[PDB]
Structure 1
């Protein structure tokens, strides 16, 4: 199916569609071009003065993103963290034996020369610097991500985390809805500060300042939901990554899986640059998102739900995928995992036990056995499995519009 030809004259046509912006980019294929990640910390002038600049700025108004970045770099310039063994990623070396590397041990580079108020602000603010203020600035990135009334319930947990031998209060007052601190999300340099904080403390989990993580955590695997759903599927089915892979039954789910499992990406690595591929600006279009894995996401999350996931209840229903074909596939998988137990001997003392009506479903969880069974069922889902799917979806309550939960209850519980 490479070559297509016009039959009336015997000539060749080459089908080609307008590529949806940039391809997939990939983390690895980036470090092929550059060896560093540019952190443009603009002003490097007076660190004590900056503390007051951000404090008075945040207290209702337009605090400069350039300001807070300059502050965070000054406040988090702690060269703490005793390297346990060795640290290397995508070829870039960061640590050896007993190295004492800090948090900004990737590139810094100076930028611009335009600043706002000029010099020493209000000397009002005492130290209590590193202690809570950095937590807040990083904590607003977590709050800025969302857009529903969950904000005034996640900012609530912001204020109650700046009391760890601190206890102060709050700062701004204006409701979110993307307007105030949300500007920061689209700042290449800000996001780079948050990603380097999460990465540093993912390595140094036992560090005192590792509390900065919650607020900066939402950056690890940002736009990598498909990968998360693949892990969730393994946990919920109890099968191995290999077995689950063999249960892919649609062509365009296979494609997506292959896309996600490209060999040289360090996705299974403990402490890598890979999970921060977006916020470190390594990739303009993640290979691992739901958006670029729509068939896989729907299929995986539908099965997950039939199998009694509570996550899946509220997953997004993608657009432009073959719902009918995908849904019957997910049903077979879920029906197979749900019906009939395994029960096999695991350990012995030199003494084992070997194991070996008509429309009866197969013994175990092997794809080939079930595939053969589905053929003999006229390639249509049985009454038993439809009743299984019903039982699974009914008594789900208050499911939101455009979720897989809403799709699944509506499909299977008439």
Structure 2
């Protein structure tokens, strides 16, 4: 009824495609992103955590698109936006207009043919900028371009200064995205690193230390401004493909990659951790509710295995506002993976948020059995073990869960809290 035999699992999911290539590509990209994310030398695992569905595939050959105001004089826009940065009074519409107008400065050579969802972005050898990836339309409404009052600059900015300002502004996206309680020190260290990056050659110091955090405090929700998020994703896709003098700008935009895909990313990370192929691993997913979710993740046509696809930034680029890859969209898989993580004492899973709707109790049962199996055999053996024990956890599984959760400082709505409430109350 509840659990399904691995034979029936294999039979019912014989139609799956590009599983291994998708897993490998997503995992390699995540590892590469760590250079811009955890590039800071501080890693304290106690740190921030990371209905119908619309698939992102573009079906009409139209590039992702936004609409902004009238193109500005870049020298004046620079002076205005910098004065706003220094005064912690930034106009988001102005900032988006400037970021789009500044895209022309970032030119590189495309190392290979670049096509995604049928859209030919570039041929090998083409000169390319972020504008090549998207359509930025502009109307005739002029921006505000106020000068706060601290701006005493008569000369024109250099391109190096432009690049430093673009980096700082886009870093406000990452700082806004960092949310939750007890994140002050983490954000302060991230901001310090960002300031360092954007005052070090080839960038140039254009603000004093602590300006970025002061401005962030007034821009706390910019990560959900659609045009700003869009521009952050555009810059990130560009620098992900094109090596460039100013690629360190990704320190602020790297968090757009695989945005709203935490279920898929958790799946591929879990597959890598247990050192199995996706085909072999799926057989351990006995529960009847997994099939729908696994098919949801491997829907064809979405380019999950294509390097540098629009897919990697689909959420930031507005290709879909209802991700079929989120933790909620595949809540059973997500809960299972993190109950296994809890069983293995992984702080990241203990602090993850339970998807309450997707049978967390049953998932913790299967999690105990799979955790035992992968702590240090086979799908059929585990299934038989579950049947022999009447679908219940063994006393040893519960002692293990409790020994982990009871000694952990459980956060609200977390897996650790669920485990304490269920097995240690």
Sort the TM-score into its range (normalised by shorter chain). 0.7 to 0.9
Q: Distance in 1 between matches of 2:337 and 2:364?
A: 10
Moved more, 48-57 or 32-41: 32-41
Aligned partner of 2:289 in structure 1 is 252
Distance 1:295 1:175, change over 3 A: farther
Q: With structure 1 as the length reference, what TM-score do the two structures score? A: 0.80
Distance 1:151 1:26, change over 3 A: same
Q: Note if contact 2:87-2:215 (Cα within 8 Å) is conserved in structure 1.
A: no
Distance 1:115 1:176, change over 3 A: closer
Matched, 1:159 2:171: no
Distance 1:117 1:45, change over 3 A: closer
Q: Distance in 2 between matches of 1:118 and 1:143?
A: 24
Q: Distance in 2 between matches of 1:160 and 1:79?
A: 21
Q: Per-residue deviation at 1:332?
A: 1.0
Aligned partner of 1:76 in structure 2 is 103
Q: Note if contact 1:42-1:110 (Cα within 8 Å) is conserved in structure 2.
A: yes
Q: Per-residue deviation at 1:65?
A: 1.6
- SS of equivalent to 2:130: coil
Aligned partner of 2:348 in structure 1 is 311
Q: 2:224 aligns with which of 174, 186, 193?
A: 186
Root-mean-square deviation (CA), in Å? 2.5
Q: Per-residue deviation at 1:218?
A: 0.7
- Structure 2 counterparts to residues 377-396 of structure 1, below 5 A: 377-393=389-405, 396=407
Q: Distance in 2 between matches of 1:291 and 1:378?
A: 29
Q: Per-residue deviation at 1:407?
A: 2.2
Give the number of equivalent residue pairs. 361
Q: Per-residue deviation at 1:246?
A: 1.1
Q: 1:407 aligns with which of 418, 421, 424?
A: 418
Q: Which runs of 5+ in 1 are unaligned?
A: 1-19, 340-363
Aligned partner of 1:133 in structure 2 is 165
Q: 1:113 aligns with which of 141, 144, 167?
A: 141
Aligned partner of 1:95 in structure 2 is 122
Q: Note if contact 2:72-2:101 (Cα within 8 Å) is conserved in structure 1.
A: no
Aligned partner of 2:43 in structure 1 is none
Aligned partner of 1:370 in structure 2 is 382
Q: Per-residue deviation at 1:181?
A: 1.9
Distance 1:66 1:400, change over 3 A: same
Q: Note if contact 2:266-2:334 (Cα within 8 Å) is conserved in structure 1.
A: yes
- Structure 2 counterparts to residues 211-250 of structure 1, below 5 A: 211-250=248-287
Aligned partner of 1:56 in structure 2 is 83
Q: Distance in 2 between matches of 1:332 and 1:173?
A: 46
- SS of equivalent to 1:138: helix
Q: Distance in 1 between matches of 2:226 and 2:411?
A: 33
Q: Per-residue deviation at 1:174?
A: 4.7
Greater relative contact order (CA < 8 Å, ≥ 6 in sequence): 2
Q: Which runs of 5+ in 2 are unaligned?
A: 1-50
- SS of equivalent to 2:347: coil
Aligned partner of 2:208 in structure 1 is 169
Matched, 1:332 2:360: no
Q: Per-residue deviation at 1:273?
A: 0.4
Distance 1:318 1:379, change over 3 A: closer
Distance 1:24 1:66, change over 3 A: same
Q: Note if contact 1:151-1:176 (Cα within 8 Å) is conserved in structure 2.
A: no
